[PDB]
Design a protein around this nucleic acid. Structure first.
Ligand code: MN
Lengths: 161, 612
DNA sequence: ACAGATATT
């Protein structure tokens, strides 16, 4: 069941270690793919995962990311607004997303309106990137054609002003 | 056989304007004992009998409210005693004008007294003072009858007859007590606080000797506005933001400058990326061109607040100076009443006549003549309030007969009136959207079509741009040097007088005639200083006062407390709430606050010890 | 030495 589960998660786009899957594995030895997807999605990604992104993803000399990939948001900042205001309507909303895979970190820029990732999105929310996605000057480009927001729930973001 | 009739108006101007209308020319010149009023006679019939009319004026507010002579001395009364243990009496304002005895000697006839005073709360106060003065001397009522009547009017041209016959009601003591309660509250709330502060700070700090520290329901929040802007200006950290600007060459050397669709980027690497996607690319396409007709809407009718704001901002005159100049102009008869909050014109207004009067001045002659020939647009509908008509010119004026600040204010008043009567501005807003890679830029321009009120206010004009090229989409304009500009956020500057007046009006602090007085008071008490473009920079005294107030029961400075007290006064006036109960409740609440303040003053003391 | 608000002609 381990091999078929690993293949199913690979197809679905989740890259989780064997120990992470076993931790996400429920009491029965029988594991349902949707059930483990839900359980893992509820948990923080830094504990469970595997090395997906290249070690130099934050240096610019990659320029491409291929295949499905699940990533965890950690901090969202509105670049087009001052740090004091953070909600001014004097600029189109551009979001800088600090994404993690559990081992390294990458930074992504909105580059277009999403209507699915907002400044109220809690850290721990997970996003799936599908198809080829562009990297320029060490920044991921997040158009609406590849970012799918899976509704996450993690206990962070307790204090906000 | 003839029965005497008495009538009282507020100023002898209204006395003339009412007698000449209600008497059909039969008047008299009977200058009174005081030497400042007039008595007018007439013959009529209000209750089916020949009655000899009599009509006079009580100029200004008759009696003021002040403490007894024992408690006015600063060194003999404990300030707290001013809250509840201090009697208060109604003295006669400007006693050299013996108004009370004038009224008493003129009042000898019964069966008729009416009240042609202002139709506001001030008018109710004045009228009940007049009735108090006049009843003890008038003739006794014979059996059951009504002797006291009141007339209500918003104009004195032809409504006066209908008011004289039908609209003969009674005065409203409930609303006439609201102003008395306000006076008593304000006097007791001040006086005591300022006396305590003055006797405390004049015996502890040398540099404050022979200086007055004043607290009031309107002065202190006014200072607090400037102090909070000072807190914001000294509690701001500049932030660096990068704006990407690129230019294109349209035909030969037009050098069209564009601005980025995303107006700013508060990051360095992101801005460098967005430059790297645009720098090395040499062409630029166009995606959308939009030509839209838009209208810059005409100004409303002038009121005192907007007049003061414009005098402070554009003309360069203080609020008290502007108010004094307006009062002087009204006294000479050039303009109308200058303290009015009515941005709406009355239905029966001679707009054509007022505009035709200003048809022989070499600054507005052509515009006024063309406007009268073509037609006049109806003025914008505004917020009427019933307190006198808006400020409008009433007589032709020229540089020779008045000069300086008087002319500089008259010019603005006349131009505002003409602009209100004139047409509306129209301009083409042409926006062109360029694409210089995976990046969008835009360029906007304005082109006037029919200058309306712009022709009479050449400071609301649309700036002259050099037009935009007619692009048909799919162009291939060459680009220039796409540069990443580095900029810093600018800290806010100190409050201007116009902004302070706007805050006063928004929060209800002060009235149409007390805003300049409050601003001048905070300026002369060495709390704020006027600097550059009429900016009110707070001084050390203002900073320490407002900060200490924030530390010590911080609700004596917030603008909301004055609004709450005013709501209580309105509840008094309408009738829902009583008078003595609310008087005592507010007095005791603020007495508790003052007792807290007196023993908590150590915070303000230690906050002042850092300064002088 | 005071509040605020108003102020003929
Ligand atoms: Mn009045």
């Amino acid at each position: 069941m381990a091999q078929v589960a690993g293949a199913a998660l690979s197809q679905a786009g989740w890259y989780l270690s064997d120990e992470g899957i076993e931790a996400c594995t429920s009491s029965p030895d029988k594991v349902n793919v949707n059930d483990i997807i839900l359980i893992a999605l509820n948990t923080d990604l830094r504990t469970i995962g595997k090395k997906f992104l290249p070690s130099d993803i934050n240096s610019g000399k990659v320029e491409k990311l291929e295949g499905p990939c699940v990533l965890q948001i950690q901090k969202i900042r509105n670049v087009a607004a001052p740090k004091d205001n953070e909600e001014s309507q004097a600029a189109p909303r551009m979001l800088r997303l600090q994404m993690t895979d559990g081992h390294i970190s990458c930074t992504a820029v909105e580059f277009s309106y999403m209507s699915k990732i907002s400044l109220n999105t809690p850290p721990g929310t997970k996003v799936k990137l599908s198809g080829i996605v562009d990297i320029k000057n060490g920044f991921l480009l997040l158009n609406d054609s590849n970012t799918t927001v899976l509704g996450g729930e993690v206990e962070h973001l307790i204090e906000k002003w | 056989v003839m029965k005497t009739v008495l009538m009282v108006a507020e100023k002898p101007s209204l006395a003339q304007s009412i007698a000449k209308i209600l008497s059909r020319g039969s008047l008299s010149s009977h200058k009174g004992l005081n030497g400042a009023c007039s008595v007018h006679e007439y013959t009529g019939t209000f209750a089916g009998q020949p009655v000899r009319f009599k009509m006079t004026s009580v100029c200004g507010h008759v009696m003021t409210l002040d403490f007894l002579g024992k408690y006015n001395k600063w060194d003999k009364v404990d300030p707290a005693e001013l809250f509840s243990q201090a009697p208060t009496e109604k003295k006669e304002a400007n006693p050299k004008l013996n108004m009370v005895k004038f009224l008493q000697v003129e009042g000898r006839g019964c069966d008729y007294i009416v009240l042609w005073l202002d139709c506001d709360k001030e008018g109710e106060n004045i009228c009940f003072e007049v009735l108090d003065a006049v009843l003890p001397v008038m003739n006794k009522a014979h059996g059951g009858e009504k002797t006291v009547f009141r007339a209500r009017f918003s104009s004195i041209t032809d409504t006066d007859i209908c008011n004289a016959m039908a609209c003969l009601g009674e005065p409203d003591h409930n609303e006439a007590l609201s102003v008395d309660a306000r006076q008593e509250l304000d006097l007791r709330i001040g006086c005591a606080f300022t006396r305590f502060q003055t006797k405390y700070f004049q015996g502890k700090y040398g540099d404050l000797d022979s200086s007055l520290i004043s607290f009031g329901p309107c002065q202190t929040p006014t200072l607090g506005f400037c102090v909070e802007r000072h807190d914001k200006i000294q509690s701001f950290k500049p932030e660096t933001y990068w704006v990407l600007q690129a230019k294109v060459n349209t035909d030969k050397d037009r050098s069209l400058l564009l601005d980025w669709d995303r107006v700013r980027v508060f990051d360095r690497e992101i801005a460098q990326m967005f430059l790297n996607m645009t720098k090395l690319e040499k062409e630029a396409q166009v995606e959308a061109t939009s030509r839209k007709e838009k209208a810059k809407q005409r100004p409303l009718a002038l009121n005192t607040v907007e007049m003061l704001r414009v005098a402070s901002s554009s003309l360069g005159m203080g609020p008290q100076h502007a108010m004094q100049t307006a009062e002087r102009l009204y006294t000479q008869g050039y303009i109308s009443f200058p303290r009015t909050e009515t941005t709406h014109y009355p239905e029966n207004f001679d707009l054509k006549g007022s505009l035709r009067q200003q048809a022989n001045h070499p600054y507005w002659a052509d515009t006024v003549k063309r406007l009268l020939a073509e037609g006049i647009n109806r003025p914008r509908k505004g917020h009427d309030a019933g307190d006198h008509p808006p400020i409008t010119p009433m007589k032709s004026a020229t540089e020779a007969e008045l000069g300086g600040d008087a002319w500089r204010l008259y010019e603005y008043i006349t131009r505002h009136f003409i602009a209100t009567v004139s047409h509306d501005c129209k301009y083409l807003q042409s926006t062109i959207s360029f694409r210089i890679g995976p990046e969008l830029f835009t360029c906007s321009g304005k082109t006037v079509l029919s200058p309306g009120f712009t022709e009479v206010m050449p400071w609301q004009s649309v700036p002259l741009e050099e037009s935009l090229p007619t692009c048909q989409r799919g162009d291939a304009f060459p680009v220039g040097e796409v540069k990443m500009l580095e900029k810093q956020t600018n800290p806010p500057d100190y409050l201007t007088e116009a902004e302070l007046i706007t805050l006063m009006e928004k929060h209800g602090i002060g009235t149409d005639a007390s805003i300049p007085v409050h601003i001048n008071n905070i300026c002369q008490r060495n709390y704020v200083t006027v600097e550059s473009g009429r900016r009110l920079k707070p001084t050390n005294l203002g900073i320490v006062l407002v900060h200490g107030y924030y530390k010590i029961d911080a609700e004596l400075v917030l603008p909301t407390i004055r609004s709450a007290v005013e709501k209580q006064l309105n509840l008094i006036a309408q009738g829902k709430a009583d008078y003595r109960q609310v008087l005592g409740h507010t007095l005791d609440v603020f007495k508790r606050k003052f007792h807290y303040f007196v023993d908590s003053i150590a915070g303000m003391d230690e906050l002042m010890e850092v300064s002088f």
